[PDB]
């Protein structure tokens, strides 16, 4: 009964960050050595926990949040960060306890003009772990939009122009945010030991 990090990290299709996919990891024994040890990652930052020490450490619930942003936005997947993603797509709490794992996916998500979406406009910042999937025509002006695009009325999602030749900051990056839950409940996710 091993935890399915394979169908999270090695998943063929990742999700757009506005609709970031969350996988509930429970009732299994995750081995995080496969992650922190093995694979070539552009970013593997852990907050409130050290990647080595989880191999014998139980958690009541682990949440694997996968999505796609571009290089310049991987820095926004952190506690106390701002920007397009952290405010309107995927917000981490300031007291976040978990690891943010990201890797370049230029060869996977850039073809010729693959299209991942991300939320441009939102009236307020996302609460931690909030997931806004509404396509309500965003109201920038004073006149209500009534679901028709126009001036001052914009579709709140926009496609990443993911094209292979992009600069590293513009190339797509796949992000998996493992958040570990300290609940007052039976522990369902543990290290192998």
């Amino acid at each position, epitope marked *: 009964n091993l935890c399915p990090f394979g169908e999270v990290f090695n998943a063929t299709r990742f999700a757009s960050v506005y609709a970031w996919n969350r996988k509930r990891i429970s009732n299994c024994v995750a081995d995080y050595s496969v992650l922190y040890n093995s694979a070539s990652f552009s970013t593997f930052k852990c907050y409130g926990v050290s990647p080595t020490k989880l191999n014998d450490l139980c958690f009541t619930n682990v949440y694997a949040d996968s999505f796609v942003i571009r290089g*310049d*936005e991987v820095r926004q997947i952190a506690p106390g960060q*701002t*920007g*397009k993603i*952290a*405010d*309107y797509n995927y917000k981490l709490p300031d007291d976040f306890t978990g690891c943010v794992i990201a890797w370049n996916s230029n060869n996977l998500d850039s073809k010729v*003009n693959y299209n991942y979406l991300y939320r*441009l*406009f*939102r*009236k*307020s*910042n*996302l609460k931690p772990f909030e997931r806004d999937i509404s396509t309500e025509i*965003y*109201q*920038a*002006g*004073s006149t209500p939009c009534n679901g028709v695009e126009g*001036f*001052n009325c*914009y579709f709140p999602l*926009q496609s990443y*122009g*993911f*094209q292979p*030749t*992009n*600069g*590293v*900051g*513009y190339q797509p990056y796949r992000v998996v945010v493992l958040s570990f839950e300290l609940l007052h409940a039976p522990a369902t996710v543990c290290g192998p030991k």
Partner: antibody
Amino acid sequence: EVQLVESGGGLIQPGGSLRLSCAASGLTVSSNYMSWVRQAPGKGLEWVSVIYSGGSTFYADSVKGRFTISRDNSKNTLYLQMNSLRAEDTAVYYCARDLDVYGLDVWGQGTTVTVSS
Amino acid sequence: DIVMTQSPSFLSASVGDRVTITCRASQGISSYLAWYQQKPGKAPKLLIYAASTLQSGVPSRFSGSGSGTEFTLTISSLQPEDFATYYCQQLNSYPPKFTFGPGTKVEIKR
């Protein structure tokens, strides 16, 4: 009525502060990316700052820690407080409406800020 | 560093000419470019966004083309109004929100 009217520019000594106001009409500033872009005389356009709809503010490293972008939802106004001004900040400052890839579709007339000792 | 370069710096053409202004990103920005017109004194005016889409209210003779590292702004038939300076800007250019080009000034040929 789809206009951006900024003021508050002028001639100040270096180190002195100066506040640019940008009254908006035809759009809500709190519902928009509102950015300040400056252009030195005879030079190109330089991004100064931006305020998101959610409230998060960003600045160019050239003005980081000296400038403060804000807004008045009541007055539907954008503000750029320029503290410890340096002569390098001498430029025409345009209040524009950022739309990330939809572009800076609506610009203000622009207010001149001359900083010199 | 990601730098935007405009060529030529000054361009000379007559009313009715097809003019093409080249913009070059040091690395690919795939379609995250806008094209702006500025006259002396007046504010910049957005002409093209997403490197090809024409802004509402902008003459149809303006067109934006190119994806990635080399972009063009084309006026099929130059009008008296189109004598101005043209700037290409980089959208979402992380450290600064926007990175503008050096500017191309279209001039009357004689």
